[PDB]
């Protein structure tokens, strides 16, 4: 059917430490990249991280050559719409990635005001993003396929500014 | 005697023990259904530098042994429909005789 042995992920999603821990769940989690169950590999990126898992399928991510969790690229980091446009990947890339890719989700009780968890709340009790921007309006195939990619649109537009 | 040599009885028993362990692993898989360190040579240059081995422990999560399956029948392609098409090279095919159509 669909089996795997090791996750093809990026160094940003792998965690900011040489030693990590993986958890393999064979044939589960319903990977929507190929509509087939894959080995869901959960891990911990570090202290105060998101502790996410694998989302895309194994064979479905081999043709795209992107991360298992971030699903951007393999070496540069641009989206698939920006990678298929064009070196163009040398200038659009950026080393030392931000912690927002490994940051946890927001607290819905903090947005509602009744954050009864307190200082032991694992979620981030900060302000959410602006919904007027297209950066918080992506989808499943919108990030995987190059069609309707808002992150790739601003990457080619801001590349010619000065 | 070296050209027509027979294999050892211990080598045949070791091949039988490996085949019995392989058949028992397939029978246990049929009855059930019916650390590591990967060197980041993809983009490891400066982002989280010093990761030469990138050790990740493979801890298998013990699932609940009473549950419906998590998905339906998998409609994914497991392998490749091309093959290694090894050539015949048996004999040169030629005509038999002029009387082969009459025989």
């Amino acid at each position: 059917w669909e089996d795997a042995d090791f996750p093809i992920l990026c160094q940003t999603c792998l965690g900011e430490n040489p030693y990590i821990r993986m958890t393999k769940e064979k044939y589960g989690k319903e990977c929507k990249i190929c509509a087939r169950p894959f080995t869901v590999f959960r891990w911990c990126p570090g202290v105060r991280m998101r502790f996410k898992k694998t989302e895309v399928c194994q064979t479905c991510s081999k043709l795209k050559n992107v991360c298992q969790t971030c699903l951007l690229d393999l070496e540069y980091g641009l989206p698939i719409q920006v990678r298929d446009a064009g070196d163009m990947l040398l200038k659009l890339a950026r080393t030392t990635p931000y912690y927002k890719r490994n940051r946890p989700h927001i607290c819905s009780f903090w947005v509602k005001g009744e954050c009864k968890r307190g200082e032991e709340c694992p979620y981030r009790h900060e302000k959410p993003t602006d919904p007027d921007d297209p950066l918080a309006d992506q989808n499943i195939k919108d990030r995987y396929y190059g069609i309707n990619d808002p992150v790739a649109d601003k990457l080619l537009k801001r590349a010619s500014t000065m | 005697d070296p050209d027509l040599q027979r294999p050892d009885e211990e080598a045949i028993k070791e091949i039988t023990e490996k085949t019995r362990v392989a058949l028992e692993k397939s029978v246990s898989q049929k009855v059930a259904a019916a650390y590591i360190r990967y060197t980041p040579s993809q983009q490891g240059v400066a982002f989280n530098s010093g990761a030469k081995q990138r050790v990740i422990r493979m801890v298998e999560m013990q699932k609940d042994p009473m549950e419906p399956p998590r998905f339906k029948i998998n409609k994914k392609i497991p392998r490749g429909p091309p093959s290694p098409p090894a050539p015949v090279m048996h004999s040169p095919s030629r005509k038999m005789t002029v009387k082969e159509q009459q025989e």
């Binding site: 042995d5 090791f6 430490n17 040489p18 030693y19 821990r21 | 650390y35 590591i36 360190r37 990967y38 060197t39 040579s41 081995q53 050790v55 422990r57």
Partner: peptide
């Protein structure tokens, strides 16, 4: 390229976290 090791998981997780 995967390359497993036969080291202990207890001493490895204790040394990296320290």
């Amino acid at each position: 390229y995967a390359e497993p090791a036969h080291i202990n998981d207890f001493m490895f997780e204790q040394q990296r976290r320290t």
